Structure 1
Amino acid sequence: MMKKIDVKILDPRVGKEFPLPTYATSGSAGLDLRACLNDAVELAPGDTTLVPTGLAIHIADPSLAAMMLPRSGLGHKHGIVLGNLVGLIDSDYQGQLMISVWNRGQDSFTIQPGERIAQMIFVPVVQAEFNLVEDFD
């Protein structure tokens, strides 16, 4: 399925100097998120920093969620992943999307303004209601 999602641009560079997230191909599962920074940030081995995106989304449909994931190349080659490992975005969240960037490797890394630093997928979710039982089938 396809879905239109309302988005608010919070920093006027988003959609200009810092491109809006896009799907690379018709068959891509995820879109790439970019670092909305004024200057580069040096991240030493072991350290975590919070990177803004300059945007907010409103998924609004409670049957849908988004998940933020590391990029494959950054993660495998540079040890640049997420501090919370995976970021879960609720359908009712309307704040700025923030990225927890963590250096899990041994080499210092320069995070540049505008760099694709994470990816984000939209997946269907189910809200569970618990039915208390003494035994299962």
Structure 2
Amino acid sequence: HQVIQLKILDSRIGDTIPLPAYATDGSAGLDLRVCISEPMQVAPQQTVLLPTGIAIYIADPKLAAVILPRSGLGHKNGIVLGNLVGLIDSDYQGELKISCWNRSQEHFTVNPGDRIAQLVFIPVVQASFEVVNEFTE
């Protein structure tokens, strides 16, 4: 494993709303829950910014995280991400927030504590470009 610092920004996290955790030993992603005080209505085509109540600090520049829709919410309810895929840089230390976009024709309710996205830690490579007149092998 790799250690990632997490700062709890809302006292509900770790009490009434669990920290993110891997469901199984074989899970690639961590479900991300929303930290809100009352149910949030998401109308068809609406985008709403939803706080998680946590911040992470990846720190290692060879690692990033991506935030993806949940498969069931996306397929069944059209509850996806307004920016489609979120990218979390190694030096990002702000609260994780979810751009929740309803692409469906049905109104949707997000309840406090609901899982609405997933977080996946991936290795990344920082490239150095070499400007060339023609590509070579």
Normalising by the smaller structure, the TM-score range is over 0.9
Deviation, 1:53, is: 0.3
In structure 1, distance between residues paired with 2:114 and 2:74: 14
Give the secondary-structure state (helix, strand or coil) at the position aligned to 2:74: helix
Identity %: 65
Letter aligned with residue 75 of structure 1: G
Residues 1-137 of structure 1 aligned to structure 2 (within 5 Å): 2-137=1-136
Deviation at 1:9, TM superposition (A): 0.3
Gaps of 5+ in 1: none
Q: Which amino acid aligns with 2:80?
A: V
Q: Report the 3-state secondary structure (helix = DSSP H, G, I; strand = E; otherwise coil) of the residue aligned with 2:73.
A: helix
Secondary structure of the residue aligned to 2:56 is: strand
Give the alignment's TM-score, normalised by structure 1: 0.98
Aligned residue for 2:116, secondary structure, equals: strand
Listed one character per residue, the Cα deviations across residues 18-57 of structure 1 (whole Å, up to 9, x for unaligned) are: 1111111000000000010011110110000000000100
- How far apart, in 1, do the equivalents of 2:70 and 2:82 lie? 13
Gaps of 5+ in 2: none
1:61-113 Cα shifts (integer Å, max 9, x gaps): 00000000000000000000000000000000011000000000110000110
**Aligned CA-pair RMSD:** 0.5
Which aligned segments of 4 or more residues in structure 1 are displaced greater than 4 angstroms?
Answer: none
